[PDB]
Ligand binder design. Structure first.
Ligand SMILES: Nc1ncnc2c1ncn2[C@@H]1O[C@H](CO)[C@@H](O)[C@H]1O
Ligand SMILES: Nc1ncnc2c1ncn2[C@@H]1O[C@H](CO)[C@@H](O)[C@H]1O
Ligand SMILES: [Mg+2]
Ligand SMILES: [Mg+2]
Lengths: 254, 254
């Protein structure tokens, strides 16, 4: 009779709201500093850079911008996750497609996303969305973004979707398009693929966690790359016992 | 054969490590500014202040300090949560007591906690732990803190535990003791009771979430009060369907 713990946490708890507000406060402070003192590097990795040796698209004289993942980064998909909890069928690509098409009035903003987006625009920073919602559902997604109070997104200018190129769920191509036009000074997401495709398509659960602590990646967290919680679905909900609970740290009760 | 999703997320995922590193980066930047420009208010609520109208213990000329919850804020209780996942018996106060006594070699630091604590001490900020581990298990808890790389804690100076007063799991009394001696300029936690007992002992799930968005509270997140994720146990894992999925945001698949 109770929803899954991850959904209780993410959608129900004050803990999760405080955590999200924290991310957006750190992001606004970071953008503010960069608006006063424009950086040499943008926050989007250069083509061909690896997690071994991160290099970035330079900032240049391009217009300042912030890039956001949509789902569980600025918008909470309450309707869909209600359905998943009611039915137990969270993995259902056809129902997800229906949801992309008809869910625009069952979303809520992530706590602080509305204030955060308004502030970015008042600082002269363009807000750009890069989501793996499908291109053919661009218009319902625009209306869902507007309904969540996040403003007016425009396909191919400030909204980039899966299928806008032939890389599928890989977002690096769209990041490159975006970084070719703007100086992206902050990027927000709830999954590591919202920052680099290099975290996915191969690396194990333990490899990906280690990669976030690589020094040139680790410096980005809360300082260019901003993270929102998602213990409900996606690339964080993987791994067996040996990858979640490493064996030097195990213990048995008496 | 797979652990609970919240544990996959928190202990296994790079998503969760990046999120924690973000919290500690924002905290170090905030402490740094406060070390240059000492504030008038500390970060600990004054006695008698309400969530309606937050007021704070002044900073004065007291020594600078940062206060941390221990469990799932600076230290990951991997051994205990392995046991909980293996057995299904997460709520077991006797096994938790055993764990307090014998788990010191089955803990890991939260990503970034070791670097963060070292930096605070190099900046001249005293690191103070306020945990609801029990007073009578102070010494194993000191050794677990040291094992996690978090340095040397001292009962009644830099380590405060449940039972140090007669308020039980209520931490406001110990916060007051701490704020009477230090200018606490940052406080970290994974549950709202790590910031104020006023979030607990009454308020419903939806009330507590709303309270984090009260303006004078909302300004603290990532800016004095720093949050770490815990979708595994505690006050974030509460509420029925109506409190997790509000009814204006519900949706049915076709
Ligand atoms: N609870 C969930 N479980 C699985 N996939 C989910 C869930 N919520 C949303 N999704 C999304 O639904 C699609 C597959 O069901 C993917 O895009 C995935 O990200
Ligand atoms: N998975 C868990 N479920 C319930 N309580 C837990 C869990 N992990 C740790 N605890 C702690 O164990 C004690 C009760 O089992 C409480 O202090 C609670 O915070
Ligand atoms: Mg997302
Ligand atoms: Mg804790």
């Amino acid at each position: 009779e109770t929803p899954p713990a991850g959904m209780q946490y993410l959608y129900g708890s004050g803990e999760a709201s405080a955590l999200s507000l924290q991310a957006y406060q750190a992001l606004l402070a970071h953008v503010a500093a960069k608006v006063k003192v424009r950086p040499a590097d943008s926050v989007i990795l250069a083509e061909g850079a690896g997690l071994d040796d991160p290099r970035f698209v330079p900032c240049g004289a391009k217009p300042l911008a912030a890039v956001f993942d949509v789902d569980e980064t600025v918008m909470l998909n309450i309707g869909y996750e209600y359905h998943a909890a009611r039915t137990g069928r969270g993995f259902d690509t056809a129902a997800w497609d229906a949801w992309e098409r008809t869910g625009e009035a069952a979303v809520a903003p992530v706590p602080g996303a509305d204030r955060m987006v308004r502030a970015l625009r008042q600082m002269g920073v363009t807000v750009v969305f890069n989501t793996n919602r499908a291109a053919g559902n661009a218009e319902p997604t625009v209306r869902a973004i507007k309904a969540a109070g996040l403003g007016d997104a425009v396909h191919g200018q400030t909204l980039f979707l899966s299928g806008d190129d032939a890389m599928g769920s890989r977002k690096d191509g769209r990041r490159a398009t975006i970084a070719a036009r703007y100086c992206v000074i902050a990027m927000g997401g709830d999954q590591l693929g919202d920052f680099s495709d290099l975290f996915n398509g191969g690396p194990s659960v333990t490899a990906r966690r280690a990669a976030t602590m690589q020094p040139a990646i680790a410096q980005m967290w809360g300082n260019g790359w901003f993270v929102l919680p998602n213990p409900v679905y996606g690339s964080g909900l993987k791994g067996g016992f040996d990858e979640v609970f490493p064996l030097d740290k195990r213990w048995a009760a008496p």
